[PDB]
Design a binder for this molecule. Structure first.
Ligand code: UP6
Ligand code: UP6
Lengths: 219, 219
């Protein structure tokens, strides 16, 4: 499975190229995996992925939460992987055919799919939470190996780990800004995703170092 | 509501700028409303919206199926409207806070949100279909005025029309390539979305004219 340095993935959701590159540079010694989403890509373009690879050599997860019909999902993944992304996130709610479409392209291009199971925000309780266990089982049936689950609900994160098994790889956003605890989250997740607590910090480097200090026993 | 020429919206999912522009230009006499999705945007950049506005007299719906947490949804909408999109599509299944985030940006920036209710592909049956009526009702309670529903399931499109009422605006994909019929769909939708049936045709203009001829009594 993916080996994430310090079990810490930077969510780089700044929307200015100079700021994104500066801040990522400031925390580069602590990470080797950056999650890039639509806030940055739609503001600066898909070439920003190649630029991160050129500058940092970091692994890039494109957090695009692909959620279309199969035919369109295929096109989105192709474009995304052409841009240099190592992995892409995919919603499970739209069903198995939509997920399989992404799995196909990933296999073809030597990339990874991360299946989003339950989201960490309050609205996730309305529809997603009630489908989340079934979505995880669907992932298992499909041979999905990488999953995303909620730091803000450690009991749900734990259940999701139970479903997918210890061999699957699980990452978790919602740490810090949204209320999730780094150490508690790493009881169940392989790696935590952290955005604002780092990139909005007066001193991002000290922010990252602080978080890592707090989980040092968990490596 | 937006005044969609010939009740027909082109889904421009070609991924090459030259082809996308050629084909759109060829059908411009029949349409004035173009849906641009991630296949084209991730391939050619957000400036493709600007290029389409410069070249054609078309409104642009950015079919981004926004499906993140509220804070990220806000950023995606801001970047998308900054680029000149008239409207953006938004998934309802991540819950009310996620939708409201998009509505708030849309209200602030004087643009529109289309709420996706049930999707037209087979996988939609697994999870979305069971939530779709409640997602539509949620949209009504939030004040959403624009909706997307499936051509491929007339009975579901009819029900979704009932929920949102006759005053709401409803557009429907799944016509042609996915099996939906233009005429039957327009019994309930204000406009049909058509992609491959047009953009893959040897003569896209003849394809569009042919669809229009078949629904002329509904125009
Ligand atoms: O369920 C969730 C919640 N958040 N995120 C993403 O993870 C990051 C969390 O950032 P934050 O640490 O600033 O809250 C953001 O990019 C957000 O879109 C998810 O992918 N899934
Ligand atoms: O439920 C659906 C089904 N399709 N689409 C989108 O509408 C277009 C359908 O194109 P087609 O006519 O080539 O099938 C594509 O852009 C597809 O992503 C949706 O937004 N929702």
């Amino acid at each position: 499975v993916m080996d994430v340095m310090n079990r810490l993935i930077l969510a780089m959701d700044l929307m200015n190229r100079d700021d994104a590159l500066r801040v990522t540079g400031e925390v580069r010694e602590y990470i080797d995996t950056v999650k890039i989403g639509y806030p940055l890509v739609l503001s600066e373009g898909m070439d920003i992925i190649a630029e991160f690879r050129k500058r940092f050599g970091c692994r890039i997860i494109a957090d695009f939460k692909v959620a279309d019909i199969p035919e369109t999902n295929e096109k989105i993944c192709r474009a995304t992987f052409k841009a240099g992304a190592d992995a892409i996130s995919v919603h499970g709610f739209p069903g198995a055919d939509s997920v399989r479409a992404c799995l196909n392209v990933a296999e073809e291009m030597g990339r990874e799919v991360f299946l989003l199971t339950e989201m960490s925000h309050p609205g996730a309780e309305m529809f997603i939470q009630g489908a989340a266990d079934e979505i995880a089982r669907m992932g298992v049936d499909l041979g999905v190996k990488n999953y995303v689950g909620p730091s803000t609900r450690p009991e749900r994160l734990s259940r999701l780990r139970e479903i997918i098994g210890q061999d699957s790889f699980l990452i978790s956003p919602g740490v810090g800004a949204q209320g999730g605890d780094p150490g508690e989250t790493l009881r169940f997740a392989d790696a935590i995703i952290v955005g604002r607590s780092i990139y909005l910090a007066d001193n991002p480097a000290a922010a990252a170092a602080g978080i890592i200090e707090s989980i040092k026993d968990l490596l």
